[PDB]
Every structure is written in C-alpha cells, then in structure tokens.
mmCIF file of C-alpha atoms and ligand atoms in Angstrom:
data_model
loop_
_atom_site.group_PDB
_atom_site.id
_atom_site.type_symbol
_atom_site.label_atom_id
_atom_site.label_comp_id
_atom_site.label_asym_id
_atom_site.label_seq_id
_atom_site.Cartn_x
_atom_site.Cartn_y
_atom_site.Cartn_z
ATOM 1 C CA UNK A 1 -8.169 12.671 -8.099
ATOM 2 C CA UNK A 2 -7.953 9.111 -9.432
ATOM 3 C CA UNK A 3 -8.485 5.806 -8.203
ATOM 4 C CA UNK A 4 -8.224 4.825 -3.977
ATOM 5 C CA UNK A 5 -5.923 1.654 -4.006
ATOM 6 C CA UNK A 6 -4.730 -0.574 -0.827
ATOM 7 C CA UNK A 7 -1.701 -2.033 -2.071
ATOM 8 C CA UNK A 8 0.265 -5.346 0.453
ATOM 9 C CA UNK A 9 2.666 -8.723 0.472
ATOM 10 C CA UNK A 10 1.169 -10.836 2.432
ATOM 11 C CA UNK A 11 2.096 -13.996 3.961
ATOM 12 C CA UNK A 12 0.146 -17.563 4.024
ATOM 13 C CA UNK A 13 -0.775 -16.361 7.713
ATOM 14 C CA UNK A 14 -1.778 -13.230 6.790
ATOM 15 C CA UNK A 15 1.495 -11.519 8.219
ATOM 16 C CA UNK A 16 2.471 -8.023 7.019
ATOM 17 C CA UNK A 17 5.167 -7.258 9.573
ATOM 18 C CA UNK A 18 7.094 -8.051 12.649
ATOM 19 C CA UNK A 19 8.643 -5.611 14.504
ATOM 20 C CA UNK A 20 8.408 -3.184 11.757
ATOM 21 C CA UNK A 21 9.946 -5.332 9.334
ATOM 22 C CA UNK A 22 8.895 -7.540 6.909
ATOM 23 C CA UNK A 23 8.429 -11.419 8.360
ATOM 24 C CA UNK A 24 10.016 -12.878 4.955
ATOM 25 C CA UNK A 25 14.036 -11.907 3.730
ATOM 26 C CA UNK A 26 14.121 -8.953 1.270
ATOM 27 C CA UNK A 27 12.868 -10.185 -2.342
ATOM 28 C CA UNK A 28 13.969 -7.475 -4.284
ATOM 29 C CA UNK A 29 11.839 -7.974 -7.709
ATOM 30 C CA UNK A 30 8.431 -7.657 -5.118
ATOM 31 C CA UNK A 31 9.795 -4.278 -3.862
ATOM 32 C CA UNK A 32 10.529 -3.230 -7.574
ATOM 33 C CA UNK A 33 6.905 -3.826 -8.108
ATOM 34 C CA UNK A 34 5.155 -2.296 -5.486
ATOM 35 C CA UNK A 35 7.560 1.085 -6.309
ATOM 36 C CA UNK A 36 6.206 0.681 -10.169
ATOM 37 C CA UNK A 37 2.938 0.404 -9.025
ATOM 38 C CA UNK A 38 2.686 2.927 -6.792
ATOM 39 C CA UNK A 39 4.697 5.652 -8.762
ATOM 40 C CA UNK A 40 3.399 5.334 -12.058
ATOM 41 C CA UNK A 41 0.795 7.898 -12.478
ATOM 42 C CA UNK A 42 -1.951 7.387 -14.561
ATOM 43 C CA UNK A 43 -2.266 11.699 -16.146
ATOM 44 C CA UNK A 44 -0.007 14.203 -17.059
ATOM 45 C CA UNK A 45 1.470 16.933 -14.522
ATOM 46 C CA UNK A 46 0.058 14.872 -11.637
ATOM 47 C CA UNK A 47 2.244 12.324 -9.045
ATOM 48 C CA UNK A 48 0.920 9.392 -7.124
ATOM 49 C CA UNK A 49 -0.246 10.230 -3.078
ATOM 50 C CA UNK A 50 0.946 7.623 -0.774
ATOM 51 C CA UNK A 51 -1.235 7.153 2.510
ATOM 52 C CA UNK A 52 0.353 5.339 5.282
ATOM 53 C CA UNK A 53 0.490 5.458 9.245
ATOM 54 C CA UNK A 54 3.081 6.467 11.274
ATOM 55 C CA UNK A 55 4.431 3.417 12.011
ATOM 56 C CA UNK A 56 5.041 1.894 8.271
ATOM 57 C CA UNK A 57 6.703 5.356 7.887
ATOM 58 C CA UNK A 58 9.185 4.745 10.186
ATOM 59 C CA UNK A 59 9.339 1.006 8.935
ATOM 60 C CA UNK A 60 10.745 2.307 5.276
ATOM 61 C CA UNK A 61 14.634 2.575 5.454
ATOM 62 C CA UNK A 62 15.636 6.379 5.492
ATOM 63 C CA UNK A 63 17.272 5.848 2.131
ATOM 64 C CA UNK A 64 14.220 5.353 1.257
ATOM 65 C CA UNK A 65 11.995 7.966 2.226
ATOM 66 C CA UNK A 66 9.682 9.519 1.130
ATOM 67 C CA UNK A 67 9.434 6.983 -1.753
ATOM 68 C CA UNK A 68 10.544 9.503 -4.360
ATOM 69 C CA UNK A 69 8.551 10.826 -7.163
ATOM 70 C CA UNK A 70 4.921 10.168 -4.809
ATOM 71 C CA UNK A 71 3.365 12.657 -2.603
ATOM 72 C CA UNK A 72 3.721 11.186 1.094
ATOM 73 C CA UNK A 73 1.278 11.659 3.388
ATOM 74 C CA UNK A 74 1.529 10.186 7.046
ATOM 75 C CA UNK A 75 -1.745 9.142 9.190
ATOM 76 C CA UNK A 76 -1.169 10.469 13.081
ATOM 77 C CA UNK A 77 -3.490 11.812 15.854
ATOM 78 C CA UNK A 78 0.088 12.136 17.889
ATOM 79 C CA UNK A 79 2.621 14.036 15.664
ATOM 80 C CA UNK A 80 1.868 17.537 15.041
ATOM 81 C CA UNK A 81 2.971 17.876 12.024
ATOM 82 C CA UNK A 82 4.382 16.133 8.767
ATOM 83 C CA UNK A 83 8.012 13.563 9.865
ATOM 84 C CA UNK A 84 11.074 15.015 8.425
ATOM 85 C CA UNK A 85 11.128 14.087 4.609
ATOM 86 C CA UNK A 86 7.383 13.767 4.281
ATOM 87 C CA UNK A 87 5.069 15.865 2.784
ATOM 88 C CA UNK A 88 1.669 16.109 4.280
ATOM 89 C CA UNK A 89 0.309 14.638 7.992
ATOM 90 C CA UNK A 90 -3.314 14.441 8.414
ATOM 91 C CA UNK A 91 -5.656 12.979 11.214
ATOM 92 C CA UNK A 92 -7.115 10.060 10.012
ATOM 93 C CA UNK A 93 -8.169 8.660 6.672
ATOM 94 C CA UNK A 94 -10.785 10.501 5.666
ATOM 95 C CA UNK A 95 -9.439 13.335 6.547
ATOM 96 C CA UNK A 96 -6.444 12.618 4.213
ATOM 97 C CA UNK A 97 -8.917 11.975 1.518
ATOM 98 C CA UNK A 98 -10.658 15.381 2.397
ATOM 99 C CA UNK A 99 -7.551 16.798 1.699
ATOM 100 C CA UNK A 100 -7.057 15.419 -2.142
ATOM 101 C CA UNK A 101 -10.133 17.605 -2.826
ATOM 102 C CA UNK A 102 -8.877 21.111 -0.869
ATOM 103 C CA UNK A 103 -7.223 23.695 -3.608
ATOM 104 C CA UNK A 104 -3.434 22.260 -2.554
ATOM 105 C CA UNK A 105 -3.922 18.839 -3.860
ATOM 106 C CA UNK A 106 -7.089 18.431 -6.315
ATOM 107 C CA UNK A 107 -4.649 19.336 -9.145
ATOM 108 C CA UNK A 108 -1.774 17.573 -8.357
ATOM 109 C CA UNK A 109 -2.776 14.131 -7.210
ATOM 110 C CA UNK A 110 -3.423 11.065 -9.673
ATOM 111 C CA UNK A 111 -4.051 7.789 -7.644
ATOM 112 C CA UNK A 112 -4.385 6.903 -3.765
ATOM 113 C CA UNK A 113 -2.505 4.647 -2.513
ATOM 114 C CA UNK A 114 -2.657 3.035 1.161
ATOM 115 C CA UNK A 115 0.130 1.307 2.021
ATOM 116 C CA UNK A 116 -0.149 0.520 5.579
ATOM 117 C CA UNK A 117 -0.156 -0.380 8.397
ATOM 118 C CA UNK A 118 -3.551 -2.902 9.482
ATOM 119 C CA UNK A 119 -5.830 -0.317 10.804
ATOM 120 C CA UNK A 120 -5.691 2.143 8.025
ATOM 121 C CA UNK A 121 -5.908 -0.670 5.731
ATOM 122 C CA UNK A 122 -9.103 -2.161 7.752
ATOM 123 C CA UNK A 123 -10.771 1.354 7.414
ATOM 124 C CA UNK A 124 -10.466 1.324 3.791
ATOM 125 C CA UNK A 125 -11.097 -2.260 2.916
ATOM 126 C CA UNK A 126 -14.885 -1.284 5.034
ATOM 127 C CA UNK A 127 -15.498 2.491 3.194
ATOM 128 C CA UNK A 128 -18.188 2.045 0.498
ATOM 129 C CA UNK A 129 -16.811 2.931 -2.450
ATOM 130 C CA UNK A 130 -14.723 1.959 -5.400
ATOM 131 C CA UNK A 131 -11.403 0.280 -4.321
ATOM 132 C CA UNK A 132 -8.642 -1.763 -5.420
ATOM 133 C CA UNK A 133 -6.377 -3.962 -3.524
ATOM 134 C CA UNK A 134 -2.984 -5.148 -5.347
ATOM 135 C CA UNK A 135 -2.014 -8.512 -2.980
ATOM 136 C CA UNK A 136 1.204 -9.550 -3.319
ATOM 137 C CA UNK A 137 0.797 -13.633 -2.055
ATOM 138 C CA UNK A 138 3.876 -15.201 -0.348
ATOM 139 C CA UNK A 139 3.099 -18.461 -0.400
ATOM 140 C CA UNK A 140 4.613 -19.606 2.943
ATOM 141 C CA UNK A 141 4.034 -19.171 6.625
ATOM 142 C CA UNK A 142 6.043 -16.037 8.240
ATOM 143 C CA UNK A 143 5.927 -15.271 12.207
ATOM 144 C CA UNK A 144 4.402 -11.765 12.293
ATOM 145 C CA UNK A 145 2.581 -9.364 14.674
ATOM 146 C CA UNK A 146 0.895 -7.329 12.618
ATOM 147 C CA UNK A 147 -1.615 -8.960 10.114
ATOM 148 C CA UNK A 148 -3.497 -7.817 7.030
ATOM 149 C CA UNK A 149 -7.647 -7.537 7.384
ATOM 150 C CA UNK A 150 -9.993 -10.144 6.250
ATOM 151 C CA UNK A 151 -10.904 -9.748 2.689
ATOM 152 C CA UNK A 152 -14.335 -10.495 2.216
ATOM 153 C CA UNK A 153 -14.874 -11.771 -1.423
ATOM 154 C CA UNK A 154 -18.150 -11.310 -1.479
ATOM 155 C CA UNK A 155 -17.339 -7.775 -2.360
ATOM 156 C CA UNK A 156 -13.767 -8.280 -3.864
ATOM 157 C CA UNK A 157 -13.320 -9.590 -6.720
ATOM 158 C CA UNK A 158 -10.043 -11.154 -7.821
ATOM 159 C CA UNK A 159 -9.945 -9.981 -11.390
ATOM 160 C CA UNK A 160 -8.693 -12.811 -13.954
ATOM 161 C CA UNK A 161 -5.240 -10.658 -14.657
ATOM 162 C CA UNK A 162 -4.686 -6.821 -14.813
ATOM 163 C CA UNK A 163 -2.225 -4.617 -17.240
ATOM 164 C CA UNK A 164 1.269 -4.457 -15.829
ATOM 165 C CA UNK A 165 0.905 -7.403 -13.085
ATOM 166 C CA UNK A 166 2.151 -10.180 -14.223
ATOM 167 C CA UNK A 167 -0.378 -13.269 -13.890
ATOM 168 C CA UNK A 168 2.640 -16.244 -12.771
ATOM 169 C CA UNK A 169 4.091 -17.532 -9.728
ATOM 170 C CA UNK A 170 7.588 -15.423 -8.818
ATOM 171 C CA UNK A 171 10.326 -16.975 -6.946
ATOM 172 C CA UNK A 172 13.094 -14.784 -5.274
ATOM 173 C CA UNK A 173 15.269 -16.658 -2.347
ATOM 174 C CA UNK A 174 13.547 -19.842 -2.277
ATOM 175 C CA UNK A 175 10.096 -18.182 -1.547
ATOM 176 C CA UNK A 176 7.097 -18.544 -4.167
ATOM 177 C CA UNK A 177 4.623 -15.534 -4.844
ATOM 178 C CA UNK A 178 2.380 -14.245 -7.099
ATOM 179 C CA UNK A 179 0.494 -11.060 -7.483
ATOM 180 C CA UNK A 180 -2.930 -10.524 -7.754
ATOM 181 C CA UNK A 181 -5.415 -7.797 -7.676
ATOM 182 C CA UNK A 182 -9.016 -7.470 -5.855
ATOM 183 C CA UNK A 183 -11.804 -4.780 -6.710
ATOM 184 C CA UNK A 184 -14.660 -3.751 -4.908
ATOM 185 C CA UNK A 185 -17.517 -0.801 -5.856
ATOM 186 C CA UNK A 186 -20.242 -0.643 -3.180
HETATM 187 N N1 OAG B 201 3.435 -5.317 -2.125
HETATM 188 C C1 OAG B 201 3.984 -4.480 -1.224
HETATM 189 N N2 OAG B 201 3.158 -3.611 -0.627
HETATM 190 C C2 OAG B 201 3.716 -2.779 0.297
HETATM 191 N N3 OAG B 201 2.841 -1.924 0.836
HETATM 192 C C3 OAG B 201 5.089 -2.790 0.525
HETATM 193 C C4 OAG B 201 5.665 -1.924 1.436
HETATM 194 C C5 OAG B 201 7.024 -1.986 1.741
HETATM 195 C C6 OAG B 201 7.501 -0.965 2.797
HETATM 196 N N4 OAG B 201 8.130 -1.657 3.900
HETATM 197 C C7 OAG B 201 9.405 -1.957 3.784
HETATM 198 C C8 OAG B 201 10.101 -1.705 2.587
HETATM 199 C C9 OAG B 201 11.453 -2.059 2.527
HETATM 200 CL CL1 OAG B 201 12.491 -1.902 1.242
HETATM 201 C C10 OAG B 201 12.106 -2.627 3.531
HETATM 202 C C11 OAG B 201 11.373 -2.731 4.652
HETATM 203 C C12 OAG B 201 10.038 -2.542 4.864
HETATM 204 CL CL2 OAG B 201 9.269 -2.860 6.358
HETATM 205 C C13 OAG B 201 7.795 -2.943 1.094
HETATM 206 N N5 OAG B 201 7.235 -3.802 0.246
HETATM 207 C C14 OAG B 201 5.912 -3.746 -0.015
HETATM 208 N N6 OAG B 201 5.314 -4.588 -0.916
#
C-alpha cells in the first residue's frame, strides 16, 4: 500500500461543513481537484482507497457516489455493513488500515486517502507516522459546525510547492483559495 493522505477545503475559520454541506457555494475547479487528487493512482493495476465516516458519505450527492474509479471505504461502529454503493465498512481507522494489509486489499490498493469528517481526520493528523495533508485554503470566513483539527506545524511542514498542485491563488465565485500541502513523519 502507498502513501496515508488527509486531504480538506477549509475555511478562514476552520469550517469544513454545515449541515452536511459545504459552508462556501460550489467552486467547481476545487472539486475537480480534490477528484484528480484522490483518483490518480500512483502504480499500475492498483486504484486509490478512500476513508471517510459515515456522515461525509452521506454528505456526497448520490450522483456521486462512490467517487468512481477509488475503492470506498466507510468508518461506522453503527452500520453493519458497507452503505449501498460502497465498497468496504470497517470499525474505526485503524482497523480500516488493518484491512489494506489482509489478502483482499494488499494488492489492489495504491494511496490512502481520508477525506472526512473531523474525528477521523483528528485521529490521523495524531498517528505517528508518515502523512500528508493536501489543504485546500478558502480565504474567507464561512458559518460552519463542523471544523477541521488543529494542525500543529511543528510536525507539518508546508512544503514550498508539490507536482500537480498548483502553487497560486484560485478564484471561483468571488471566493479566493489556494492549495497547499503539509507533511509530517514521526
Ligand atoms: N479539498 C477537498 N477535500 C475534500 N475532502 C472534499 C470533499 C468533498 C465532498 N463533499 C461534498 C462534495 C460535493 Cl460535490 C458536494 C458536497 C459535499 Cl458536502 C468536496 N470537496 C472537497 N474538497
């Protein structure tokens, strides 16, 4: 299995959702990147596993679930087993991550993703280990009530630019952002 990634737009008040929506209007270039990023795998005859709770499930429009051409994988203690259109349902994180490793997924899995919601991002922004965060930055204040974790740069580093993510501020609907990406190993 390849590299464990958190991957998030985030507002200037660290907002990642109300009501199970996003806080900002739909910018439809930041949703082409986050399905770029998150599909393209990095090996041959291997996809892309998405991790996320139940909750940001159910936040993704039906149309578009699963995100096609990923493995989806949903976090719940409650279901028993896998929503309808997803792949895989497992406890908790790291029993999600146990799973890359069993014989039905060591193959077939290139990168990790997590893409949600705050506690399953919280777990794995405090697992030693190496991990990326891709932070998409909308610069302007959104009324949420659900909020992305602290990110404590004295582990993460914001790297200085990173292939395929482009370095500038984006505009889409009056709203600046920019992307940027974070790395930790400990
Ligand atoms: N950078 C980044 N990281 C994530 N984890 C994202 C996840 C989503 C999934 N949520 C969602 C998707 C649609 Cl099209 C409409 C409504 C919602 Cl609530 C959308 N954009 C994301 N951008």
């Amino acid at each position: 299995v390849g590299s464990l990634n958190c991957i998030v737009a985030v507002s200037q008040n660290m907002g990642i959702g109300k009501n199970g929506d996003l806080p900002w209007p739909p910018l439809r270039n930041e949703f082409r990147y986050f399905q770029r990023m998150t599909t393209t795998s990095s090996v041959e005859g291997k996809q892309n596993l998405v991790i996320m709770g139940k909750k940001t499930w159910f936040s993704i429009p039906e149309k578009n679930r699963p995100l096609k051409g990923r493995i989806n994988l949903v976090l719940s203690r409650e279901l028993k087993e896998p929503p309808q259109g997803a792949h895989f349902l497992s406890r908790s994180l790291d029993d999600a991550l146990k799973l890359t490793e069993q014989p039905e997924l060591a193959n077939k899995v290139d990168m990790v993703w997590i893409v949600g919601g705050s506690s399953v991002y919280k777990e794995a922004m405090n697992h030693p280990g190496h991990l990326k965060l891709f932070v998409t930055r909308i610069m302007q204040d959104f009324e949420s009530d659900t909020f992305f974790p602290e990110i404590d740069l004295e582990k993460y580093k914001l790297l200085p630019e990173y292939p395929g993510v482009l370095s500038d501020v984006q505009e889409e609907k009056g709203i600046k952002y920019k992307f940027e990406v974070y790395e930790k190993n400990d």
